[PDB]
């Protein structure tokens with residue numbers, strides 16, 4: 001599913017991302033825009049052989065199991081494919097674990113390069129929240 005900007009904001013807010021570990025909702029929306037273009041089905045292969053899954057491009061080397069990333073972990077205890085659903089629950093739950101891991105939202109390269117330090121509140125302007 002390809003979310004609209006405010007639909008996803010609302011969905012994120014209902015699943016408790018809003019100010020999670022001190023990151024305001026706009027950060028999360030901005031990160032999803034640049035990582036996946038709001039598409040729960042996006043996948044991207046990495047040079048190391050791992051794959052990034054879903055709206056928040058969560059990586060198979062540490063967080064979910066794809067059966068094809070040797071020696072990898074599965075800290076979120078979920079098959080990666082589950083992160084691709086129309087229901088973002090599982091992605092949000094795994095994202096909470098990532099952002100708590102010590103580097104905050106910097107674990108998302110595109111947040112760091114395209115959202116950090118910008119007026120992230122723009123991403124929720126106009127939305128009935």
Ligand code: NA
Nearest residue numbers: 060064072073
């Ligand atoms: Na894995």
